[PDB]
Amino acid sequence: QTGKKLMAKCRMLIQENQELGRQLSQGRIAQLEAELALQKKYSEELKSSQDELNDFIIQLDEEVEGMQSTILVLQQQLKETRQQLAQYQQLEHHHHH
Amino acid sequence: DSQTGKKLMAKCRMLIQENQELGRQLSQGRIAQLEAELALQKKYSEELKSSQDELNDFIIQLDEEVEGMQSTILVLQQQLKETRQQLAQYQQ
């Protein structure tokens, strides 16, 4: 009798849809939870490697400044040594008629 | 000689490259993840719809059959009433 068989067919499809929809749902929750853990792990590694780079950038900044001062000090030392050398040469040349 | 600018410069370059390569690879992974999850979501959306349409098909058939059974009960109850009435007249 078709009332009975249609009732059975309906129940069987409802059970399939309901079991399916629970799987889609549990699958989405598991995926979200896995992405969350992985994104948190990444943010820890990001924060740490930025700190390490930022410390080396500070040192590099200090060193670029030191090098610039060294060039400045050397230039002035060279200027003063060159003018003394020149004066001695001018005195010698003059002293040789 | 221990901590020159050249050494620091190389160290900062090396660190920047590792950080950028990491951020890139992980960016690709996030995009691939979203692409796959979008694809699955659209696939299930379709399978869902066709399962729902199948169910609704039989639900409508079942609905008609419940209606037809209710009709049959009504007709049978009426026929039984009329037959018992005629019969009753012969029972005296």
Residue numbers in the entry:
A (entry chain A): 23 to 119
B (entry chain B): 21 to 112
Question: What do the authors say?
Answer:
N6-methyladenosine (m6A) is the most abundant and prevalent internal modification in mRNA. In mammals, m6A exerts pivotal roles in posttranscriptional regulation and its dysregulation is implicated in various diseases including cancer. m6A is installed by a multicomponent methyltransferase complex (MTC, also known as the m6A writer complex). The mammalian MTC is composed of the core m6A methyltransferase METTL3–METTL14 complex (MTC core) and several regulatory proteins including WTAP, the adaptor responsible for METTL3–METTL14 localization and proper substrate recruitment, and VIRMA (KIAA1429), the specificity mediator that mediates preferential m6A modification at the 3′ untranslated regions (UTRs). WTAP and VIRMA are important subunits of the m6A writer complex.
In parallel, we obtained the WTAP protein alone (residues 130–241, WTAP130–241) using the Escherichia coli expression system and determined the crystal structure of the WTAP (2.40 Å). Two molecules of WTAP (with the assigned density of residues 150–241, WTAP150–241) formed a symmetric parallel α-helical coiled-coil homodimer through hydrophobic interactions between two identical surface patches. Specifically, the side chains of residues M158, I165, L183, L204, I208, L211, V215, M218, I222, L225, L229 and L236 from the two WTAPs formed a hydrophobic interaction network. However, compared to the WTAPs alone, VIRMA-bound WTAPs bent around the observed N-termini (around WTAPA residue 188 and WTAPB residue 185) and displayed a more compact and dense conformation with distinct intramolecular interactions.
